[PDB]
Design an enzyme around this catalytic site. Structure first.
Site, PDB file in Angstrom:
ATOM      1  N   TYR A 153      -1.260  11.496   2.312  1.00 52.36           N
ATOM      2  CA  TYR A 153      -2.033  11.793   1.123  1.00 52.36           C
ATOM      3  C   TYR A 153      -2.019  13.275   0.763  1.00 52.36           C
ATOM      4  CZ  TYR A 153      -4.552   7.329   1.648  1.00 52.36           C
ATOM      5  OH  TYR A 153      -4.933   6.013   1.756  1.00 52.36           O
ATOM      6  N   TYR A 184     -11.426   8.951  -3.786  1.00 52.22           N
ATOM      7  CA  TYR A 184     -11.629   9.002  -2.339  1.00 52.22           C
ATOM      8  C   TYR A 184     -10.515   9.843  -1.684  1.00 52.22           C
ATOM      9  CZ  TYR A 184      -8.045   5.479  -2.254  1.00 52.22           C
ATOM     10  OH  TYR A 184      -6.902   4.775  -2.536  1.00 52.22           O
ATOM     11  N   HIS A 236      -7.580  -6.278  -0.389  1.00 52.42           N
ATOM     12  CA  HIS A 236      -6.596  -5.252  -0.181  1.00 52.42           C
ATOM     13  C   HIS A 236      -5.653  -5.579   0.983  1.00 52.42           C
ATOM     14  CE1 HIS A 236      -4.562  -1.555  -0.003  1.00 52.42           C
ATOM     15  NE2 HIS A 236      -4.829  -1.431   1.288  1.00 52.42           N
ATOM     16  N   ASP A 255       0.841  -1.194   0.000  1.00 51.88           N
ATOM     17  CA  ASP A 255       0.000   0.000   0.000  1.00 51.88           C
ATOM     18  C   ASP A 255       0.883   1.254   0.000  1.00 51.88           C
ATOM     19  OD1 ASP A 255      -3.025   0.878   0.374  1.00 51.88           O
ATOM     20  OD2 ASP A 255      -1.863   1.963   1.949  1.00 51.88           O
TER      21      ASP A 255
HETATM   22  C1  LIG Z   1       3.594   8.247  -7.827  1.00 46.14           C
HETATM   23  C2  LIG Z   1       2.296   8.106  -7.058  1.00 46.14           C
HETATM   24  C3  LIG Z   1       1.152   7.600  -7.667  1.00 46.14           C
HETATM   25  C4  LIG Z   1      -0.040   7.468  -6.978  1.00 46.14           C
HETATM   26  C5  LIG Z   1      -0.089   7.825  -5.640  1.00 46.14           C
HETATM   27  S1  LIG Z   1      -1.616   7.711  -4.766  1.00 46.14           S
HETATM   28  O1  LIG Z   1      -2.643   7.714  -5.764  1.00 46.14           O
HETATM   29  O2  LIG Z   1      -1.591   8.734  -3.766  1.00 46.14           O
HETATM   30  N1  LIG Z   1      -1.756   6.279  -3.956  1.00 46.14           N
HETATM   31  C6  LIG Z   1      -2.133   5.029  -4.659  1.00 46.14           C
HETATM   32  C7  LIG Z   1      -2.104   3.949  -3.589  1.00 46.14           C
HETATM   33  C8  LIG Z   1      -3.443   3.545  -2.874  1.00 46.14           C
HETATM   34  C9  LIG Z   1      -3.362   4.134  -1.487  1.00 46.14           C
HETATM   35  C10 LIG Z   1      -4.521   3.937  -0.532  1.00 46.14           C
HETATM   36  O3  LIG Z   1      -5.327   4.846  -0.588  1.00 46.14           O
HETATM   37  N2  LIG Z   1      -4.693   2.886   0.290  1.00 46.14           N
HETATM   38  C11 LIG Z   1      -5.755   2.880   1.303  1.00 46.14           C
HETATM   39  C12 LIG Z   1      -6.828   1.847   1.007  1.00 46.14           C
HETATM   40  C13 LIG Z   1      -6.769   1.046  -0.128  1.00 46.14           C
HETATM   41  C14 LIG Z   1      -7.739   0.098  -0.393  1.00 46.14           C
HETATM   42  C15 LIG Z   1      -8.712  -0.095   0.535  1.00 46.14           C
HETATM   43 CL1  LIG Z   1      -9.929  -1.286   0.203  1.00 46.14          CL
HETATM   44  C16 LIG Z   1      -8.834   0.674   1.660  1.00 46.14           C
HETATM   45  C17 LIG Z   1      -7.860   1.609   1.901  1.00 46.14           C
HETATM   46 CL2  LIG Z   1      -8.033   2.598   3.330  1.00 46.14          CL
HETATM   47  C18 LIG Z   1      -1.905   4.277  -1.106  1.00 46.14           C
HETATM   48  C19 LIG Z   1      -1.173   4.505  -2.469  1.00 46.14           C
HETATM   49  C20 LIG Z   1      -0.847   5.937  -2.852  1.00 46.14           C
HETATM   50  C21 LIG Z   1       1.027   8.373  -5.019  1.00 46.14           C
HETATM   51  C22 LIG Z   1       2.213   8.495  -5.726  1.00 46.14           C
END
Ligand SMILES: Cc1ccc(S(=O)(=O)N2C[C@H]3C[C@H](C(=O)NCc4ccc(Cl)cc4Cl)C[C@H]3C2)cc1
Length: 320
Positions: free
Chosen positions: A239, A156, A297, A108
């Site tokens: 974030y 989100y 996840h 993650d």
């Molecule tokens: C270069 C770069 C690209 C995208 C990014 S991004 O778009 O900021 N992000 C995508 C990934 C997904 C995330 C995440 O939000 N995980 C919580 C989460 C997931 C599923 C579930 Cl079911 C529930 C929960 Cl709470 C952490 C990562 C960072 C950053 C940097």
């Protein structure tokens, strides 16, 4: 059913990387150093089923509380949680432990960190593995906000931007928070794709959710106790550096990752979907893959045996 960890029985380590920032980890095993980096909103304890197995397989395992979590410092300033700062602090961490390299395995947000460690500090990264999180090169002509609008899969994350808003929801009832999030795919009580529309994660979910088949009450209560220390501001601040992270990432475009690398997908993660990782080979020539069926996840606790099998095979082959 793999051996888990009892927090009281672990070695707990603390490194001050900067005057007001100390990182906490647990450490088990002898052998090549393997540094486990958890996601949002998790804990070192998210690796509880991996730490004994990896140690038994002949590795020295360091499972972090990432900055903002657990017994690690949680300064309030947003910029303390940009990727550049977090990666520089992980290098400091290795320096003060006297480690020239480690293997970095993340999930993650931790997966995103280990990719930018591989990219910007390859000399310190023996090999890199990500659970669920793909590596995708920054697009220098598309801002993060433009990238969300254009393709609103991660929208989100807009709910997470304004300081205080998501904190009030996630801190209201920590037991409900963790019981609501930590579920198998088929047990979901909320959709991350509908968060923006509804104005929250739990606005339409049970007030008193049932316990997921993946976790016990005692396990939930550990997370609750950990998040009472600093709450959700630090975690959410991961974030809140979108523009900063994008600019930093853009400084690396073109350069490849040539160190040994493993990408592991999870069939039923509906946010970090397997297909997001397609074409990573274009930037990572030495990329190996794994895939877990029937896995959502929360990879480590949904399918711990499979994770352990995959990681140990890869470690024994490509990082040693
Ligand atoms: C270069 C770069 C690209 C995208 C990014 S991004 O778009 O900021 N992000 C995508 C990934 C997904 C995330 C995440 O939000 N995980 C919580 C989460 C997931 C599923 C579930 Cl079911 C529930 C929960 Cl709470 C952490 C990562 C960072 C950053 C940097």
């Amino acid at each position: 059913l793999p051996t888990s960890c009892n927090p009281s029985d672990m070695s707990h380590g603390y490194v001050t990387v900067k005057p007001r920032v100390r990182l906490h980890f647990v450490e088990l095993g002898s052998g090549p150093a393997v540094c486990l980096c958890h996601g949002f909103p998790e804990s070192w304890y998210s690796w509880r089923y991996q730490i004994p197995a990896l140690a038994q397989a002949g590795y020295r395992v360091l499972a972090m509380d990432m900055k903002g979590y657990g017994e690690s410092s949680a300064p309030p300033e947003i910029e303390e949680y940009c990727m550049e700062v977090l990666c520089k602090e992980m290098v400091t961490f290795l320096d003060k432990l006297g480690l020239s390299q480690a293997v970095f395995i993340g999930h993650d947000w931790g997966g995103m960190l280990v990719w930018y460690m591989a990219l910007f500090y390859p000399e310190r990264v023996r090999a890199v593995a990500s659970l669920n999180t793909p590596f995708i090169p920054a697009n220098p002509n598309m801002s993060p906000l433009e990238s969300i609008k254009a393709n609103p899969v991660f929208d989100y994350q807009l709910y997470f931007q304004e300081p205080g808003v998501a904190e009030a929801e996630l801190e209201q009832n920590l037991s409900r928070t963790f019981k609501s999030l930590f579920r198998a795919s088929d047990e979901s009580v909320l959709s991350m794709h509908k968060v923006c529309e509804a104005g929250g994660l739990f606005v339409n979910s049970p007030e008193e959710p049932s316990l997921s088949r993946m976790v016990t009450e005692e396990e939930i209560q550990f997370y609750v106790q950990q998040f009472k220390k600093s709450g959700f501001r630090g975690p959410l601040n991961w974030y809140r550096n979108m523009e900063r992270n994008w600019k930093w990432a853009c400084k690396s475009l073109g350069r490849k990752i040539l160190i040994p690398a493993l990408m592991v997908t999870a069939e039923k993660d509906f946010v970090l979907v397997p297909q997001m990782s397609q074409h990573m080979e274009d930037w990572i020539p030495h990329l190996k893959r794994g895939h877990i069926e029937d896995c959502g996840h929360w990879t480590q606790m949904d399918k711990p045996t499979e994770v352990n099998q995959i990681l140990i095979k890869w470690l024994d082959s490509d990082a040693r």
